[PDB]
UniProtKB/Swiss-Prot annotation, chains C, F, G, I:
This is Capsid protein p27, alternate cleaved 1. The gene is gag. It comes from the Viruses. Homodimer. Homomultimer. Homohexamer. The chain holds residues 391 to 468 of 701 of the full protein. It comes from Rous sarcoma virus subgroup C (strain Prague) (RSV-Pr-C). Self-associates to form the irregular polyhedron core composed of hexamers and pentamers, that encapsulates the genomic RNA-nucleocapsid complex. Assembles as a tube in vitro. Binds to inositol hexakisphosphate (IP6), which allows the assembly of the polyhedral capsid.
Amino acid sequence: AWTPLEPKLITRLADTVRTKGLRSPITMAEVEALMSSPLLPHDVTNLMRVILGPAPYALWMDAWGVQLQTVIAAATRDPRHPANGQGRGERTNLNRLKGLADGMVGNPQGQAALLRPGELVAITASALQAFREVARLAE
Amino acid sequence: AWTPLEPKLITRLADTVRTKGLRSPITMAEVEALMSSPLLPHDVTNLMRVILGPAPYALWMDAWGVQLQTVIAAATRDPRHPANGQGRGERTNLNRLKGLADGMVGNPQGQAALLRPGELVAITASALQAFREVARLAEPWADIMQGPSESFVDFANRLIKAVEGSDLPPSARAPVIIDCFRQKSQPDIQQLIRTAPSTLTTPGEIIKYVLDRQKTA
Amino acid sequence: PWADIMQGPSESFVDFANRLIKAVEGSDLPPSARAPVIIDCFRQKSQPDIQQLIRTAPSTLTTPGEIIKYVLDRQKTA
Amino acid sequence: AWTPLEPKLITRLADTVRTKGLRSPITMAEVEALMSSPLLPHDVTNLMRVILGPAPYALWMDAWGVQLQTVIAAATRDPRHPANGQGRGERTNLNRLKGLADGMVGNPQGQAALLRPGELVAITASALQAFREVARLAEPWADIMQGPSESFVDFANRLIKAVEGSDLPPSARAPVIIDCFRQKSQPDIQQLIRTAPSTLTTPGEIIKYVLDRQKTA
Amino acid sequence: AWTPLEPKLITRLADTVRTKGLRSPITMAEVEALMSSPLLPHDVTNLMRVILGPAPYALWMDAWGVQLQTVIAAATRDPRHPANGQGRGERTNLNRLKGLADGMVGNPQGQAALLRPGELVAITASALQAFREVARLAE
Amino acid sequence: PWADIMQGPSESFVDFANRLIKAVEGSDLPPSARAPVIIDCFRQKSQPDIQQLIRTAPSTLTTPGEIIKYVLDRQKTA
Amino acid sequence: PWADIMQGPSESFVDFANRLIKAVEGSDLPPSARAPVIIDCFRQKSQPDIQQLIRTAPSTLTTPGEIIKYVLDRQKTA
Amino acid sequence: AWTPLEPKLITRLADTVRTKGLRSPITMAEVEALMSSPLLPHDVTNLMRVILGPAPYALWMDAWGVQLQTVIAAATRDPRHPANGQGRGERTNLNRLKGLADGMVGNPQGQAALLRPGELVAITASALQAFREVARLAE
Amino acid sequence: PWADIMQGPSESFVDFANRLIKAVEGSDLPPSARAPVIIDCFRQKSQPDIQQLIRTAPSTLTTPGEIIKYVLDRQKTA
Amino acid sequence: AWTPLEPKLITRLADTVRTKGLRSPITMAEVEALMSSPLLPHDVTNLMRVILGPAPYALWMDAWGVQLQTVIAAATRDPRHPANGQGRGERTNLNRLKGLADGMVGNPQGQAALLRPGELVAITASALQAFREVARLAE
């Protein structure tokens, strides 16, 4: 069952990003805090939509896609990925990682249903690395 | 058994709508948060009565009715609706969706008794879409120029905001943002983008390139 | 008093509608007389540009929400 | 048996390309006309050699090669191509498509002998798409404003021309044309479109409305 | 088999429209002449693209759509339309009239294959009436 | 004479390319020596703005058509 | 003469409709040609404000009485 | 047997409508007075032809038709209408209400013969409501 | 000291590269840390014209030799 | 048995490269002279380390690697390479060509022991072509 993040925490994090900036160690610590439980693509996408401005959000979408592509290359380079399965029918496509696959587009409940925990942690680590890249790039 | 939403959360959401507005992404996130569990028509109706002003509330009632009517048309177009049943005696009328049916008018307990979970989730999704419509309606990309003294990240923020918060289809935003970066964004950056040895096919890539090679001043 | 509410020369239409609906619903009228009064106050108040905008409505508007939506669509951006 | 195209038609088409240009709809119609029967690589190659200048001819050779390579990738992705056969011995190489294979180099008769009709139609469609690409490449919508003295039909013509002859997807032209009518088209017509009692959802409808209610002057 | 109209006739008609205008009786006679054989949607569309300017072409697309919609209303009002068939499986959709149906988009050969002669004559009459409307409207 | 062709200060690039390809193909060179000559004439003629535009090409351009496409994409609109 | 009847700049619409229907019914037209003529005279006479009011009718008006009712409903009170 | 209304009363009512207007309470009282006995469609039609101008008469014909249609909808919604009968052969069509049915067109005697008293009172009430609508609309 | 080496306003790029590679290889760094340091010093030193020239590299340069070749190709002849 | 090149010849060649440059025909002739006997990877590597500056040496390492990779592609394209053998156990890896294989790293004696004469001549020709490329590139 999907539970959304508190809008109070999200508002506090947005104001933190607004006053301290993207690169302060306190901001990265707060992001790591709100990045503790494995989030669904819907959660991370809406979180970055709210806390980041338009141009940093575009940059972050780009960087997140690139990092997820690196993850999928490593996944096709190793059939023992915690997102993959043993047979070929469990291979994870980027539509399933970005939340674009069938039964997931716009629906967080179905998303949480079909996604694997390894998928969730890989998406989360990818999003964190992308946030780091964009923060280092913006300023 | 029906449990009401906390008036503390409702007060915080009302003040959020009061300060940030109806269309801010933080406000939509908060509404999605308070729209997590399937609500009864009583809950959503009182919620919109409290958080919205009078005129937005009228607009929202209209939009909610229209969306529920579309849902009921799809329901009569498919007897396998999670709100419907298999026989004809379980067909769901708009009086049952809007909470106007018998045994439901003004009573949330009876409402929660007779309603289906599919009914609840359909009502909830309809109310969310209606809220989105009214928010887009209550409050121009092709008129945006980069000022002579404005930086490029501010111009990009303003342009992406106005393009994504507009009436364009989702599949037409990236090409429009790119072609607006190329034709707006005063001729120094125009020539900087024009003389790009690589082909830039994404707003993020254009922003990165321009931020790298921009004239520090 | 609802019958003394006018749309100011510089006031937007959503503020005027909010003020009018507030004063009409928080008054001594019966519940079944609020919508017609709100409509007829939209038509006679709401300075003559919006008056003519509502008058020349190819469709018949029979609800305050519909009038508000129509006016917000076709209003003079300024 | 191979029959050459008339040099009279080719001369008329060359003069059409010389006066009207590469991108005019009349020129594309004439090319479609002379592209009616499936042509051999020799025919299309000589045709483009005659009607196109040197630099457009180089560009067209490049684009034709790229499109033929896409065709051959689709062919190796499907053994049921009308150019392919069922066994592996009928697989079609780019030397056979470009006319470079054995028994074809410089000889149109042998070319017509060994080539398949599916091969011919694929080559022809590839050449047509390459011509379209080069024409779009050889010769900005967001910078178009209605001049203070310009009429509205001239502005609409110029805007629709620049929007349809651009890099936008086909499904994004109408919304862009509408939103450019609304934000360009100096504030008298802007207010005329804004105060439209009906909702205008098509460039033709907007043009009709504005032409009806325009300020005669 | 589809045969294109001569670009010489089309060039002469375009220059006629350029000098005499859209509403002259000689121009309407020339259009009736080039509207003699039943044309495929591709032919009429390209013809109007070439002979008409951009704004008259937009107006003509609008008017042609409206007239085709009236035709389809009359067709659903009478199952004996020369474009329709007897069973319900031959009912003609606007995607088939405007050339947007499956197997027709951009391909005139397939267009000529699947289209009916009644379909062709209805499309042609609709296009002629739309041209008349736009000519009466432009000047 | 192909080796005397320069891109004028006011001339566009497609006209210069047309003139150069015409003079090179209508000359006494062997057929297998026209493309390298056209490329090396694009690089050394074609006044220093386009010279630097071709020089700083992140990709390697090995055909006159590819050079023409690249230059037409990244040319200084003026 | 019916074909010379125009709605004056200051004349109301009911007076114009009365005058036009009078002149059309008291003329040499066949009985089956009066309604279409009255409609098409409402559309082309009846100065451009009412012309545009009739033009932008979301419904199709197919009778002089219906046109009169519509115009009387949505007319610019002045 | 049909008896016409006095032209003296009709002339006085016409002058009343001419001086006082359509909406004055005295005019509505006079109309109610001349609307006392159930009138045949011929009577009401000629009365409105005489007392009303051309444009109000067109409006009144429209409104009378609409009100009669509402009456016929209520009649098909209840087989116990004083205009209807018990069997289906007495169902009242709009041609019989507007006086357009067979044996009634232009003949008031035959009209009075075939019409029911319930038909007459329904026609009369419909005409009165239509007059009220048109009077409220004209000024 | 390698971290104090800047490309002078009038110095050529091959002299700067020679000096920098000399000072980096004749220093106390481990052998496996010289190439990344030389690259990142090419990118941050080497006055902003060459900095932007390296930044806008359509290809990814992952070796000091490749960076030197690219810069020597696309450098501003002066 | 490995015999080193004379440091006197190497010093003379280094001064030749210093005064005449990399591209002079006399310099290429001198390099061809000192490239007469098949050299071990150690010899050519130290020779280029001494005669070339730091940046030309980096360029030359790159070019030598690329040319050796082309050689190894031709070798896997033909099992009759004078560096290869008949069975698959004699296939020559780039670690054996660049002197990086086991028993060769830093030891010229072991290098000369395990290397083939075909290997030596291929390495030598590759190094000569790489020197030509770098000389054409440097000036």
